[PDB]
Amino acid sequence: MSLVYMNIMMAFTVSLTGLLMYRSHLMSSLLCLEGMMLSLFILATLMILNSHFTLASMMPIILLVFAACEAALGLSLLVMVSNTYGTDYVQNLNLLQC
Amino acid sequence: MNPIILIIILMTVMLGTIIVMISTHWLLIWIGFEMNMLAIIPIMMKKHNPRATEASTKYFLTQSTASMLLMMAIIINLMFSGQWTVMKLFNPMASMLMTMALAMKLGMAPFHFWVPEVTQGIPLSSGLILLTWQKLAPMSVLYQILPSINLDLILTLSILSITIGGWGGLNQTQLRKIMAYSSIAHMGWMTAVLLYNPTMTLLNLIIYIIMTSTMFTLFMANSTTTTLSLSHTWNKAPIMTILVLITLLSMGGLPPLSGFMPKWMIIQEMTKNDSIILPTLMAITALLNLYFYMRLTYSTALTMFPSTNNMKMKWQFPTTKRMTLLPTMTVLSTMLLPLTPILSILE
Amino acid sequence: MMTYIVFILSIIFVMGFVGFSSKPSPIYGGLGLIVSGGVGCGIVLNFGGSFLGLMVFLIYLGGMMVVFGYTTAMATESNKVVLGTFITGLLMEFLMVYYVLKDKEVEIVFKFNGMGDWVIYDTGDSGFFSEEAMGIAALYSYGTWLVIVTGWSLLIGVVVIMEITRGN
Amino acid sequence: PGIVELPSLEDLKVQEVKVSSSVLKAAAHHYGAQCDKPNKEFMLCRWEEKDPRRCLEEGKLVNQCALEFFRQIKRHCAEPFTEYWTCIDYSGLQLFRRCRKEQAQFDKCVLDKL
Amino acid sequence: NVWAKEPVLVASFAIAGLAVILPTLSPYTKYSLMINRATPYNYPVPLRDDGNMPDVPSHPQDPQGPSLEWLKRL
Amino acid sequence: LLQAEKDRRVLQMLRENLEEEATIMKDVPGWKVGESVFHTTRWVTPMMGELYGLRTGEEILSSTYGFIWYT
Amino acid sequence: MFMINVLTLIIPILLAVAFLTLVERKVLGYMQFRKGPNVVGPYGLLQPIADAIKLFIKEPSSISMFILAPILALTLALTMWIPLPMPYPLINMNLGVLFMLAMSSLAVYSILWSGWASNSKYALIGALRAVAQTISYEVTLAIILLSVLLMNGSFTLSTLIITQEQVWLIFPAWPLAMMWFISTLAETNRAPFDAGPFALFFMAEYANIIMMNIFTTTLFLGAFHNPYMPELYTINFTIKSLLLSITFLWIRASYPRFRYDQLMHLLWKNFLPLTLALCMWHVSLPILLSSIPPQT
Amino acid sequence: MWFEVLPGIAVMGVCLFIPGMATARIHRFSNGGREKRVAHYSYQWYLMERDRRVSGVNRYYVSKGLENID
Amino acid sequence: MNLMITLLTNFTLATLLVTIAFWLPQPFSMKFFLVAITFLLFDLEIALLLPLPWASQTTNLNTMLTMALLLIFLLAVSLAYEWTQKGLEW
Amino acid sequence: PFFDVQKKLGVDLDHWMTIQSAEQPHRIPARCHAFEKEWIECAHGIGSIRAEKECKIEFEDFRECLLRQKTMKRLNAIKRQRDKLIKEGKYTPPPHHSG
């Protein structure tokens, strides 16, 4: 493959583990989702630049504006939770039980 | 909310599904799933209880990580053979993460914990739109990427989804968790056929959507959450009883009734292969999920519970909603046994 | 001071993602993610590299972590698990660097040719119009459908945000 | 897989235009009109066959055409053409609007004498 | 009235209305298109000669083919 | 003119480096000596490692990465 | 020699900032009614040198955050005169105006980090509102910058300093330029538009001010560029930047601070339609005057 | 009046004059009297690169003009 | 390496100045939140708009004109929606 | 499923984003143009499975264009043998600038 691609995918999967296992706050979880966005951005961009595939260069900027508005929706939800409680813990979500 | 705002938002949910159905370019598929999420959040939290806030939070986290994992699958696909044609992938790893992205998307048993949680804490309209459309649109994605699937994925996720959606449901007395467990059961039936003859899966999709629309209209006959409220629906109306009977047994799928057409043809063009142990195991667990349908039937339409005064006060007034489309979907969802040669209407 | 500056910056990139994947206080997390985005922008600006990383440097590092720090400061406000996971992630980094250097190939589930690689790369070919900048100078002639649905999803994101944050 | 074949070193010694780039931009257009009747043959070979190691002899032919052209411009007018290209030489990225009067001088030279 | 309450709003709608309506009718858009078309980025190719076609001028000083001339001619 | 010089220079580096691939592996087993990787004898453009190998720093840095962090 | 270019770039800006402090105090005195400083030192220059010395002498969080706010502010103050074409810019960036926007955003980060590390709720909500009114004008700055370079083709800014030989660009977009100048007043955090080491924080503020002055002078006007003699261009450019900085003082010393909600209300409902309408007019109009600028 | 403010303004105007003038001084000094090239595009980079190749001294400003003719 | 060296010199001189500066002694508002997300969405629409002058030389001028006016018109319409729906009151 | 409104309305509004060999905005190719064109014209009117039977050669050729992994494999083998021979003592290096 290459050398850089292994390190970017390693950074991606470590960001994915940081997204999945998370301890106390939800802001850090959404922030790790933002880091995963960065990883997909950088990966697709270096692919398209090394291919000199000039035609569909829309991918990175449109990927990031969309996953940005995903993060905007997420921040709205997290601030809604922190309004209707005291904090933004994973606790206070203990109601609505399975 | 304004009715302007809701007609706009429903138009955008429709727009997201049409973009997913319609395109030949992977970025358009990803944008379709995202736009579907973005618009489907404020259909939830139509009220403002903490139940809806927590439910939409859980749904948002699971759905957004599913969408980013799908984008990871696309980017692996173009790290390999590089073109934006929605077709056969060129990596078993890319197909693996893509099937796991859909398995987080529409609910399969490793990935299904969010579904009963999010369906309880919302009103019924949001649950209706999420089950029907959010389980319609990614089946199109699977139908477009069927030639490059490791079958162990769909097999494992399908069997495990049938048995988990079966065994969950013996304990839940809430209506909405019953309906979500029924949803995971039909996701197993709608997914295990896929690598054999997908016309079966798309017809099963149409069947399940018509059935679940009938069920949620009957639970919008009056706002009911437990089964006890349905016993009071007996005391206030006689015909809602017999329709809950017929549609519950059609969700159960008995051969004189139209809920058997999904099982029957799928077993047929499943065992014109020589998978036999897998169909008979699936059909045994299909016998299992009929029990909670049956105990709901026994609770309301067949026995009669004690009831409450002020239903005397309720006798005078009409049940004067508009049912959105009730009778057509009822007798098109139940009496449609002798039209199984409308299987081949599809392609 | 040597050739493999792409691999070096990618090591700092993996360092940054580990440094906020250990779940700190979220403003330590924001600091680490700013450093990560800066060196990712440096990496893409080292693969030529004219525009697009710097374009998103405004957005991802100009319009996102501001809002994260904003909503962290107005929401809420050392431990062995965080520091332990950081040291073990650093150790996995150290081990993968060692297997790149003193071996031939590294496999997670691929094959990666273990050496620092300017390859592949352009052979000095005559562009004269800075290929990626004219690629971004599409979307406005050929891009009919894409900016239509993109601006439409932006407008729907606007009305969604205000409704959820109490329309009206 | 099949192995490649190239012309060896004794095919690739053709004397090249070892002049700089600033002067090579400075004498562009009249090179474009006087010579470059046969370089389009080289260009047609290069586009119709994207295989150098097939078209290089037309490269030799355009090499000797350009060498003859610079011989012709050296041993005749103009000597202040040298002042012309060293006038456009120090003007950064090269513009044809800056050092313009000497371009008209060089043009009067070439229209009168040649 | 319509002007005193929100003056900058009226001026913004006015200049926006002319920036929408005015690109319809103009005597200059064809000039914009021809200038934008006739600036060769890439290389105009030579071709195998003809099937004896009365076009494609051989010399780059032969005046048969298509020409840009109105830059000097306003 | 520049295209002709560039053809002659890249053919020169290809001839140099295939001659030195013939030298540098003079006794290794297996190993055909001039293996193009592809299956169609067309003109690959090489990937700026076969144009530029064994140079140790100077020309490879000042001829690949020089422009990007130049200017 | 390139290190000498670096030192002559990033060292004399500090003397520029200190002498800007004496100039703004003197001229604001002569506005108000005040000679001074004229006692310590001849005509007050040893007075600012002693100001910086005395502020270094004195003996005054989370030392991570406590040090990483001013280090970032002042490295922005240093890095942000890289592509400004005092005729030969230090790095010929092919795109630099987007770099201007990005480093304004990094200054927003610096103020938010110092506000978080301040660790007191009144200073926290004050720094929060200051972040919001710092970020509320980078929209308008970006869109006006877009429309003024759309008249001139490319992000390179050297093509811009080419194109302003014919007319000063203040004429073919004057209200757009005026709104950009008011947004520079907002971004610099001065009047009307409104704990340590204050030397560093103060320093980064004033270097950002002189950056916006020089970027205003380059973006909108200039002088004719003499071949092989850039000294005259540098002189007339510097005098124009200084006259605009005195004009910036002249606007400082005469207006009260806005109320914060008046500031936001003014921005959105008064700049934001007017900037949009002027920007769509500069989109649709150069295609109507047979004039699209040559990106090279 | 302004009679005591033009010293500070004059000194600060020299202190803003100095980096551009020193930079132009060094650009002329570090090219043998020429101007530094500005390759925005890869084409001017290739043209500059063959220029520094054919100087022989690995230094393109020499530009060996009309002397390696014959 | 030019601008990397300059960046590093800026960092080192700033750290030198900080070390000289240090060593010688030795509840909320909802209205705050809508400003940030309003900025985020309009900044995204900025991110779409601003590569327009690179694009401004095409052969399909009418399409570029129409979609450019579409983008700015949608930006002003989102502003108009929050304007009519009192989106930034105080 | 999948519909063909993209086909019936005729305006291929998304088939320009898709592959190479189209209107790239100023007419340049990518790095692996001719490989894609060869593989597409291999498997064009083919039913996607005898395509997998009889277009494997050009598809491997395309992947070796895009990744160039085998070419890097050979290149790395050359460089490591170069390192062991220059450590062992054959030709203190002349193979650059002094042939």
Author numbering:
A (entry chain 4L): 1 to 98
B (entry chain D2): 1 to 347
C (entry chain D6): 1 to 77, 85 to 175
D (entry chain A8): 1 to 114
E (entry chain A3): 10 to 83
F (entry chain AM): 73 to 143
G (entry chain D1): 1 to 60, 66 to 199, 217 to 318
H (entry chain A1): 1 to 70
Question: Can I see the authors' text?
Answer:
CI is an ∼1 MDa membrane protein complex with 45 protein subunits arranged into two “arms”: a peripheral arm that extends into the mitochondrial matrix and a membrane arm that is embedded in the IMM (Hirst, 2013, Sazanov, 2015). In mammalian heart mitochondria, the majority of CI is found in association with CIII2 and CIV (SC I+III2+IV; respirasome) or in association with CIII2 alone (SC I+III2). Here, we report the isolation of functional SC I+III2 from ovine heart mitochondria.
Initial 3D classification identified four classes of SC I+III2 particles. These differed mainly in the relative angles between the CI peripheral arm and membrane arm and in the angle between CI and CIII2. Whereas in the closed state, ND6 TMH3 was a clear α-helix (residues Leu52–Met74), in each of the open states, the helix was interrupted by a π-bulge midway across the membrane (residues Tyr60–Met65). This loop, however, was disordered in the open states. Surprisingly, the CIII2 MT-CYB that is in close contact with CI showed lower overall resolution in the SC class containing closed CI than in those with open CI.
